[PDB]
């Protein structure tokens, strides 16, 4: 009766910030409940915790007072079976909504929707007949988004807020011999969503496991590892806090082993009761162990050496009655002055951002994912992730212990749409909701190695609340250092300065909070805390450019200690066409509204975990070796802080325009932060004509655990000499001829056969025998389909003027209309002279200016001569280049020039100067917002079907146009053109990056100077 | 239905420390929605605040599952009618409980007994029609002990936690036009129970008010005020803080006027929308005004100097909405260096601990109370006080702000009986309800003028929950300090070291919570904040000894800026005897189990304002002028920091032996802090025998607010010189005549006859005429009635055998047997030589041993002399003197030593020397548990009825034995004795006080020499 729906949803608990859990156990690290020793310690599985994951009956609703009461005492029938862990959007039950900052419902704390998209589960369980004897049986639940009320066989057993925090009832006694019922309520919005509005997909459901674990009565109920260090690192020791659940008698103990792999290192035996603390005495119910360790194995991200601190609970004659367990780290963590220190060395970040999401499952999390996901950070030189935003799936901690990789654990609170920030971390009433977000993270994952870092949330400004439990983590784990970004960076509630998208040399100054210039930061009067960007360097499409210019500072200022991209994966998400072949989709593709399109794809890696180019830019830039040439003497600098140099081989090669002549191989011997000489053999030297490059590559000979053998670390390339060629060609055995007419001009030589349009101005048309090769004349460009940095957080609607797309747009550029200033044949000695000039005017502005020379001679040979003037006052072209769409459609390319890679002038550090031979396919980059791609800059010399150009360009090669690419919204729309489109640019502007709303390109990327000169040389074999 | 008790009731909500409200309002500053401003500028009563204090119907129940659903319907016809506000346990419903750590309920959080005391409070009342249309109706309480729920028109509205902070809840939709009902039923005890745990007594109940109050729809929600000022204080700052609700509409203003007076001193008008604070912007909601006040006046306790704000909601063709106002109070306080600075100057706290108790509303508190206790306060040299320990009724601070009082407000949160201490203190569970503590004491009191000072709470050890509370307010408000004594008085959540019980110069190293002398304390390495005790002084009883050594210190030691002494009142009750009669009582004697006795009584004043002899040395300890009297000279400093001696004669006199010679009396004109100097007219000097004593008394003609006119603050003597008297008395014109006998010696004097039993020892009767004079025959005396001081915490079921008591008994000393050990009469020349010596032993030891001399002369006085031996390993005696229980009953006494009021070796300083004469009744003193007492030193002269006295003695004297004080447990038990008890001292051993529950005797009031000589000489006139 007071278990019916009707008496319970009457209080309206989803809409109250003061009750944000009803019967909650308390929380705390991972139990298991073990009652052998051996597998606890072997980390065997638990006879004593089951799992509920699988089939189960759901059924949803538009609201929650639309269920019925029957729901309490049979299945209903409509009930569609579905699995647990799941998503219900992933079901095809509502849509799921991308929104960054703007809520996805209406702003009226703490209310919430009637219209209130309940989804509710049913379970039908068999119980041993043993759980019911003794012990306590209790409920888990890892996650279970937004809020839910549940019971169990009829009737009620609590209610519980916070999608990311795991949340326990007792059901010890409501549960019968045998056959259970499982009544799940999961409210889709509740005064809790106030609190969770992070920048992702917004969805509902049981994500994460579900489990039952049956304790004994008298147990272990939380436990806290720690470990001290002495100057050198040379002793610790371990202190186990032990707090017990149960009647308390004198032949309880208590023992805490230490175990290194089968080798028990140190074991402590107590009986319960604390020392003395307050005038009332000490806790009878808890026990401190102290284990003296000597020289210990430290644990980092370099080489994660971890021990097993197996902890029981026994009787004084020996009984066991129960274990627990977990990986201990020795580690310490500390700031000191102006530096984190890491063991005691000054750790340097090279971390990203990461979220839980799969493009299949939704923010559900699998072993096999995260998996993944490591060893491809782990391959690029990642060394740590931040829980952007909120506590993860549990797995994943136990990972990064495992792996290596420093984890900055952060809570579930973000609010970020509400006027101001502050609004709720500013409210004594919020008080005890966030209060709880952050109390509870720390005490289930307090216990990890790789949590090195606890952080407050995310963008919630800067309240009262915040101080406040700042001050309690200090209070409760000074273990660790915690940060918070909110109010502007520097708040008092964060040991860091961890801004977003702080300029390396550019400052912000917006009101309240403005953005300093990253070096400039550090110096501001007062300040002397390090620098760690918690956001920086938006993988948003086309970006990752400027890059390096981070890299640089880093390494340049102590108190530069790196920070976090933005962001890991992209949040793009699977559907299916007219004929179920799938394509990804982004924000409203859904029909949700209101929401922010691509706004959610900011990854480094496709959301399938196939890698992006920037990937690349990263890996290069956040080696772990450093080198430096000097005559012929290589130093090379060890970045490592703890490891040495030992699984690893120096590749080095030298090479003349593509041609190998010379190869060696060193292993390296370089201590963490050390150095090391290395010289080469008599470097070889070529008559021959042509830039000489060396190269050096680190190799790890050996797999490892997260990467395979002969898997490259690193790399670096310096050009050596340079040979001019100083032979003038063989006076072409004939002369060329020309025709003219007063339509064109044609030349002949050969088969040979060109044509320019006397009216346009171009060269329409040429032939290779009856053979012709363009579909398209050649005409110049100073035109890209935007990237999205280009474009940003312009729509129709609303318009960005500032973006640069906008200013493109109004300047004209884009509709730009050419005019035949003059069009010139002269004949040469040996030669045929082309001569142009056109004009390309918007509204009778002259924007550009092209004026050129095609030069045929007797070898079949034109060479391009252009010369370019931009205007002043026209906002700086994309490009500036050339054009056009060949017939031949051949299935490689072949250049000699920087790649294999997609590089862009702002971002072309990783790659690599060299003769590159690719599939058409892998020159077109998969973007799914459409946009200018595949560019390969420092290009030499091109070769696609019989041509072949050559001289210094940036070019780009597809089946696309620039025009299709930009009024496709989706990559799957796209559709291949007749033949190949080629851009052959002599100049590119930058990508940007620092930021995607608003100009990311820095001067030196922009084309700015006026007039422009270069050339070309076409040709066939 | 939902309303019902059972569906309601059925939540166990008194059970849970998550849900702590119910509905609640949130918090604020006092409002009164006064419809013009004048009313508001100048305080007049608001007709939109509605008062229900009166009569109720009551009925009282065992549980609140007894409890009948009708009830919510309609009234019960054997529901009494009953008095609001009140404590139901001051009605018969139930027993106050007198209990100090020990929890009042079984300790098991957060469970409570299920017989659970409960009061059905319960009204019928009208509401106005016109209250119905607009704006919003609410209800204030400001008290509910407990925890409680609310219904109205037989709906339910919601609940509350925490006794001492008021809860609101908008009535707004239950009430009918006319006749409403109120159903509110109060619970004894709750989770909230737990964090209440004070030393008091435990009532239950609707202590304070209910109102009702109307605001308009659109109003002002919040509003803080605060004031900067400049390096000299000439110009300040107010800046006020105005929040509102409803809907904002761009014709809404808002006005704050600053008036003094009669005269505005500054305005300030503008409209909503706070500046830029975050990404997102500012508050629409709020605005802030500043105003610039130059050269305000100055707010302290010396002079408190307040103005006035108004607040008015108005639109802009200036119609109001709403006005709100406040007392201001311009002051700055500091923590700086060191020191706790107030307005610049540093301060020094004269205060005292405060509790709010009524011996007859038990804690229902009236202004009419609390003016009293400020007076009194005030009156006695007090500066401030501390509200031990939880937010008090709402009009005390206003007094404060406006009589002159420094306030420490204090959380409600006392765990005192948990173990340890910290228990729920470093629980996360219990953070919420502690969050709500302090932040709704903080939201409600901020604005006064009085709270220097903000406390978390009292005696609940040192938990992390506290470290964030303590970073909260220091975030919400840096205006003031925050101190917590829990976990050693010096931990990281107070910024002063505020220690209770710290001695002087003796430390007390308890384990985790050392109290360190106080002077020591400060120069602990690191330690540099300031010491200000938080109880100190402990007055239960015959107490207050030393209390001279804590002035000296406080005097000398900068960072030693006082304390509050523990405590004010009694908080002892009235109960009625048989014939129906008044007497005081205190724990246990409502049957009260378990209970603390008499620990619920430590005060200065009795129950009923009267004071405790303590007093007096108190005020003359914190006097504000202090003494130096050189040659003639006397030199007057003065205390004061902020205002001139402008109302205060300094009276001066000069005698000899209570005859006064002289006397001046000069104009103090001493700035603060300054000196003065009184050189005085040449002064007598006779040839006489005697003492010359100076006697300096500072007086206020001048009537004041809490001062009569002539009224004393400040005195000191200095004796100037003494003529020895080198005379002897005349040739006796006769001589005694003894006769002999078995038994006895006789001497016979004229009509006065002698008689010493000469198997006794002792001087057995005695003769003037036909008149006997003795009832018990003159004897020795080693012992004491004990002192609260000498008892502390020995029980008869447990001992403390440390306790001076337990010591006394255990030696011997009460029950030790006199053993003649020699009695002789010899005859001198003019007189009669008796000699006596006895041992006083037990179990075969001699603690002491008295040898001595009566001898009588021609003149008809004897002379006795006494020489007294006390054993090394014995417990050193109470009193070394002689008593007799005379057979005269006189009406007056006279002496010539220290009065008028009782003074004790440890405690006599605010005595003087001078002839004093009272009546017998004031010579004794009424400790509610009878002990030795009325004690009076330095006497020189003493007479009685045709007796006379002489010597140098300690005396005391009443119609009560010290047996009857010792087997009495109460006073009004006390029955007068057929005669008249004396006691005449040649020593007494001190008081104590420094606390109740050990040793407090500081060695130098111990009786420890081994030897001690006095002589008497008993005459008539
Ligand atoms: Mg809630
Ligand atoms: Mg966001
Ligand atoms: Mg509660
Ligand atoms: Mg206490």
Same mark, same amino acid.
């Given at each position: 009766?007071?278990?019916?729906? +009707?008496?319970?949803?009457?209080?309206?608990?989803?809409?109250?910030?003061?009750?944000?859990?009803?019967?909650?156990?308390?929380?705390?690290?991972?139990? +298991?409940?073990?009652?052998?020793?051996?597998?606890?310690?072997?980390?065997?599985?638990?006879?004593?915790?089951?799992?509920?994951?699988?089939?189960?009956?759901?059924?949803?609703?538009?609201?929650?007072?639309?269920?019925?009461?029957?729901?309490?005492?049979?299945?209903?029938?409509?009930?569609?079976?579905?699995?647990?862990?799941?998503?219900?959007?992933?079901?095809?039950?509502?849509?799921?909504?991308?929104?960054?900052?703007?809520?996805?419902?209406?702003?009226?704390?703490?209310?919430?929707?009637?219209?209130?998209?309940?989804?509710?589960?049913?379970?039908?369980?068999?119980?041993?007949?043993?759980?019911?004897?003794?012990?306590?049986?209790?409920?888990?639940?890892?996650?279970?988004?937004?809020?839910?009320?549940?019971?169990?066989?009829?009737?009620?057993?609590?209610?519980?807020?916070?999608?990311?925090?795991?949340?326990?009832?007792?059901?010890?006694?409501?549960?019968?011999?045998?056959?259970?019922?499982?009544?799940?309520?999961?409210?889709?919005?509740?005064?809790?969503?106030?609190?969770?509005?992070?920048?992702?997909?917004?969805?509902?459901?049981?994500?994460?496991?579900?489990?039952?674990?049956?304790?004994?009565?008298?147990?272990?109920?939380?436990?806290?590892?720690?470990?001290?260090?002495?100057?050198?690192?040379?002793?610790?020791?371990?202190?186990?806090?032990?707090?017990?659940?149960?009647?308390?008698?004198?032949?309880?103990?208590?023992?805490?082993?230490?175990?290194?792999?089968?080798?028990?290192?140190?074991?402590?035996?107590?009986?319960?009761?604390?020392?003395?603390?307050?005038?009332?005495?000490?806790?009878?119910?808890?026990?401190?162990?102290?284990?003296?360790?000597?020289?210990?194995?430290?644990?980092?991200?370099?080489?994660?050496? =971890?021990?097993?601190?197996?902890?029981?609970?026994?009787?004084?004659?020996?009984?066991?009655?129960?274990?627990?367990?977990?990986?201990?780290?020795?580690?310490?963590?500390?700031?000191?002055?102006?530096? =984190?220190?890491?063991? @005691?060395?000054?750790?340097?970040?090279?971390?990203?951002?990461?979220?839980?999401?799969?493009?299949?499952?939704?923010?559900?999390?699998?072993?096999?994912?995260?998996?993944?996901?490591?060893?491809?950070?782990?391959?690029?030189?990642?060394?740590?992730?931040?829980?952007?935003?909120?506590?993860?799936?549990?797995?994943?901690?136990?990972?990064?212990?495992?792996?290596?990789?420093?984890?900055?654990?952060?809570?579930?609170?973000?609010?970020?749409?509400?006027?101001?920030?502050?609004?709720?971390?500013?409210?004594?009433?919020?008080?005890?909701?966030?209060?709880?977000?952050?109390?509870?993270?720390?005490?289930?994952?307090?216990?990890?190695?790789?949590?090195?870092?606890?952080?407050?949330?995310?963008?919630?400004?800067?309240?009262?609340?915040?101080?406040?439990?700042?001050?309690?983590?200090?209070?409760?784990?000074?273990?660790?250092?915690?940060?918070?970004?909110? @109010?502007?960076?520097?708040?008092?509630?964060?040991?860091?300065?961890?801004?977003?998208?702080?300029?390396?040399?550019?400052?912000?100054?917006?009101?309240?909070?403005?953005?300093?210039?990253?070096?400039?930061?550090?110096?501001?009067?007062?300040?002397?805390?390090?620098?760690?960007?918690?956001?920086?360097?938006?993988?948003?499409?086309?970006?990752?450019?400027?890059?390096?210019?981070?890299?640089?500072?880093?390494?340049?200022?102590?108190? =530069?200690?790196?920070?976090?991209?933005?962001?890991?994966?992209?949040?793009?998400?699977?559907?299916?066409?007219?004929?179920?072949?799938?394509?990804?989709?982004?924000?409203?593709?859904?029909?949700?509204?209101?929401?922010?399109?691509?706004?959610?794809?900011?990854?480094?890696?496709?959301?399938?975990?196939?890698?992006?180019?920037?990937?690349?830019?990263?890996?290069?830039?956040?080696?772990?070796?450093?080198?430096?040439?000097?005559? #012929?003497?290589?130093?090379?600098?060890?970045?490592?802080?703890?490891?040495?140099?030992?699984?690893?081989?120096?590749?080095?090669?030298?090479?003349?325009?593509?041609?190998?002549?010379?190869?060696?191989?060193?292993?390296?011997?370089?201590?963490?932060?050390?150095?090391?000489?290395?010289?080469?053999?008599?470097?070889?030297?070529?008559?021959?004509?042509?830039?000489?490059?060396?190269?050096?590559?680190?190799?790890?000979?050996?797999?490892?655990?997260?990467?395979?053998?002969?898997?490259?670390?690193?790399?670096?390339?310096?050009?050596?000499?340079?040979?001019?060629?100083?032979?003038?060609?063989? +006076?072409?055995?004939?002369?060329?001829?020309?025709?003219?007419?007063?339509?064109?001009?044609?030349?002949?030589?050969?088969?040979?056969?060109?044509?320019?349009?006397?009216?346009?101005?171009?060269?329409?048309?040429?032939?290779?025998?009856?053979?012709?090769?363009?579909?398209?004349?050649?005409?110049?460009?100073?035109?890209?389909?935007?990237?999205?940095?280009?474009?940003?957080?312009?729509?129709?609607?609303?318009?960005?003027?500032? +973006?640069?797309?906008?200013?493109?747009?109004?300047?004209?550029?884009?509709?730009?209309?050419?005019?035949?200033?003059?069009?010139?044949?002269?004949?040469?000695?040996?030669?045929?002279?082309?001569?142009?000039?056109?004009?390309?005017?918007?509204?009778?502005?002259?924007?550009?200016?092209?004026?050129?020379?095609?030069?045929?001679?007797?070898?079949? #040979?034109?060479?391009?001569?252009?010369?370019?003037?931009?205007?002043?006052?026209?906002?700086?072209?994309?490009?500036?280049?050339?054009?056009?769409?060949?017939?031949?459609?051949?299935?490689?390319?072949?250049?000699?020039?920087?790649?294999?890679?997609?590089?862009?002038?702002?971002?072309?550090?990783?790659?690599?100067?060299?003769?590159?031979?690719?599939?058409?396919?892998?020159?077109?980059?998969?973007?799914?917002?459409?946009?200018?791609?595949?560019?390969?800059?420092?290009?030499?010399?091109?070769?696609?079907?019989?041509?072949?150009?050559? @001289?210094?360009?940036?070019?780009?090669?597809?089946?696309?146009?620039?025009?299709?690419?930009?009024?496709?919204?989706?990559?799957?729309?796209?559709?291949?053109?007749?033949?190949?489109?080629?851009?052959?640019?002599?100049?590119?502007?930058?990508?940007?990056?620092?930021?995607?709303?608003?100009?990311?390109?820095?001067?030196?990327?922009?084309?700015?100077?006026?007039?422009?000169?270069?050339?070309?040389?076409?040709?066939?074999?």
């Amino acid at each position: 009766i007071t278990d019916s729906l +009707a008496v319970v949803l009457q209080r309206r608990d989803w809409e109250n910030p003061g009750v944000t859990q009803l019967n909650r156990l308390a929380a705390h690290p991972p139990f +298991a409940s073990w009652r052998n020793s051996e597998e606890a310690r072997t980390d065997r599985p638990s006879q004593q915790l089951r799992s509920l994951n699988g089939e189960w009956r759901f059924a949803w609703f538009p609201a929650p007072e639309a269920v019925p009461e029957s729901w309490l005492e049979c299945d209903l029938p409509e009930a569609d079976t579905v699995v647990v862990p799941s998503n219900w959007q992933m079901h095809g039950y509502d849509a799921p909504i991308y929104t960054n900052v703007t809520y996805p419902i209406t702003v009226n704390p703490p209310f919430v929707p009637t219209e209130n998209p309940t989804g509710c589960y049913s379970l039908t369980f068999n119980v041993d007949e043993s759980w019911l004897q003794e012990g306590q049986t209790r409920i888990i639940f890892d996650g279970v988004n937004s809020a839910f009320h549940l019971w169990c066989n009829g009737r009620w057993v609590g209610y519980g807020q916070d999608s990311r925090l795991p949340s326990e009832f007792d059901l010890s006694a409501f549960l019968r011999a045998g056959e259970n019922r499982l009544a799940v309520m999961v409210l889709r919005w509740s005064d809790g969503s106030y609190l969770e509005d992070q920048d992702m997909w917004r969805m509902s459901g049981i994500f994460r496991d579900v489990s039952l674990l049956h304790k004994p009565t008298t147990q272990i109920s939380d436990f806290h590892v720690a470990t001290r260090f002495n100057d050198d690192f040379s002793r610790a020791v371990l202190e186990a806090e032990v707090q017990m659940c149960g009647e308390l008698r004198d032949y309880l103990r208590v023992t805490v082993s230490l175990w290194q792999g089968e080798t028990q290192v140190a074991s402590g035996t107590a009986p319960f009761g604390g020392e003395i603390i307050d005038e009332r005495g000490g806790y009878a119910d808890r026990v401190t162990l102290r284990l003296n360790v000597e020289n210990p194995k430290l644990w980092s991200a370099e080489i994660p050496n =971890l021990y097993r601190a197996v902890v029981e609970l026994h009787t004084a004659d020996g009984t066991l009655i129960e274990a627990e367990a977990c990986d201990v780290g020795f580690r310490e963590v500390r700031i000191e002055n102006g530096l =984190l220190l890491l063991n @005691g060395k000054p750790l340097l970040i090279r971390g990203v951002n990461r979220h839980e999401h799969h493009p299949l499952h939704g923010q559900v999390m699998d072993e096999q994912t995260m998996v993944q996901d490591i060893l491809l950070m782990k391959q690029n030189n990642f060394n740590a992730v931040r829980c952007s935003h909120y506590p993860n799936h549990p797995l994943w901690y136990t990972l990064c212990d495992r792996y290596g990789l420093y984890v900055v654990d952060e809570a579930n609170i973000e609010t970020h749409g509400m006027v101001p920030m502050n609004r709720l971390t500013d409210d004594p009433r919020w008080l005890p909701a966030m209060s709880e977000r952050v109390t509870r993270m720390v005490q289930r994952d307090r216990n990890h190695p790789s949590v090195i870092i606890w952080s407050l949330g995310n963008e919630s400004g800067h309240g009262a609340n915040h101080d406040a439990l700042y001050r309690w983590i200090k209070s409760v784990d000074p273990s660790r250092p915690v940060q918070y970004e909110g @109010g502007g960076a520097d708040t008092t509630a964060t040991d860091i300065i961890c801004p977003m998208y702080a300029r390396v040399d550019e400052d912000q100054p917006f009101p309240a909070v403005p953005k300093w210039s990253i070096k400039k930061w550090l110096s501001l009067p007062g300040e002397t805390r390090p620098l760690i960007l918690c956001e920086y360097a938006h993988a948003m499409g086309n970006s990752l450019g400027g890059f390096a210019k981070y890299w640089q500072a880093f390494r340049q200022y102590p108190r =530069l200690q790196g920070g976090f991209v933005w962001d890991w994966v992209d949040q793009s998400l699977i559907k299916y066409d007219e004929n179920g072949n799938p394509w990804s989709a982004y924000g409203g593709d859904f029909g949700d509204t209101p929401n922010d399109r691509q706004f959610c794809m900011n990854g480094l890696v496709f959301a399938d975990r196939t890698p992006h180019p920037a990937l690349t830019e990263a890996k290069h830039q956040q080696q772990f070796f450093q080198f430096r040439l000097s005559g #012929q003497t290589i130093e090379v600098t060890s970045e490592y802080l703890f490891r040495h140099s030992d699984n690893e081989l120096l590749h080095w090669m030298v090479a003349l325009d593509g041609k190998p002549l010379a190869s060696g191989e060193v292993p390296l011997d370089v201590a963490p932060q050390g150095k090391q000489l290395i010289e080469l053999p008599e470097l070889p030297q070529p008559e021959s004509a042509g830039q000489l490059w060396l190269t050096v590559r680190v190799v790890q000979p050996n797999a490892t655990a997260w990467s395979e053998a002969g898997h490259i670390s690193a790399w670096q390339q310096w050009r050596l000499a340079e040979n001019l060629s100083v032979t003038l060609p063989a +006076a072409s055995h004939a002369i060329p001829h020309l025709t003219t007419s007063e339509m064109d001009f044609c030349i002949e030589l050969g088969n040979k056969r060109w044509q320019f349009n006397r009216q346009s101005g171009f060269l329409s048309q040429m032939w290779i025998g009856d053979k012709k090769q363009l579909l398209t004349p050649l005409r110049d460009q100073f035109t890209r389909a935007p990237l999205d940095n280009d474009i940003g957080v312009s729509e129709a609607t609303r318009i960005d003027p500032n +973006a640069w797309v906008e200013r493109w747009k109004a300047a004209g550029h884009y509709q730009a209309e050419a005019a035949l200033l003059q069009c010139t044949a002269d004949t040469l000695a040996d030669a045929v002279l082309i001569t142009t000039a056109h004009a390309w005017q918007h509204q009778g502005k002259t924007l550009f200016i092209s004026r050129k020379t095609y030069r045929i001679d007797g070898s079949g #040979q034109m060479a391009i001569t252009v010369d370019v003037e931009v205007a002043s006052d026209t906002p700086h072209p994309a490009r500036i280049g050339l054009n056009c769409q060949l017939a031949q459609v051949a299935e490689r390319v072949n250049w000699l020039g920087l790649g294999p890679q997609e590089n862009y002038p702002d971002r072309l550090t990783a790659a690599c100067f060299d003769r590159w031979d690719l599939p058409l396919s892998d020159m077109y980059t998969p973007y799914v917002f459409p946009s200018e791609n595949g560019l390969r800059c420092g290009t030499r010399e091109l070769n696609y079907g019989p041509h072949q150009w050559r @001289g210094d360009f940036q070019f780009n090669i597809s089946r696309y146009s620039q025009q299709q690419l930009m009024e496709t919204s989706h990559r799957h729309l796209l559709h291949a053109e007749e033949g190949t489109w080629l851009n052959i640019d002599g100049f590119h502007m930058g990508i940007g990056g620092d930021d995607s709303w608003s100009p990311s390109v820095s001067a030196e990327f922009q084309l700015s100077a006026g007039r422009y000169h270069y050339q070309l040389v076409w040709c066939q074999k």
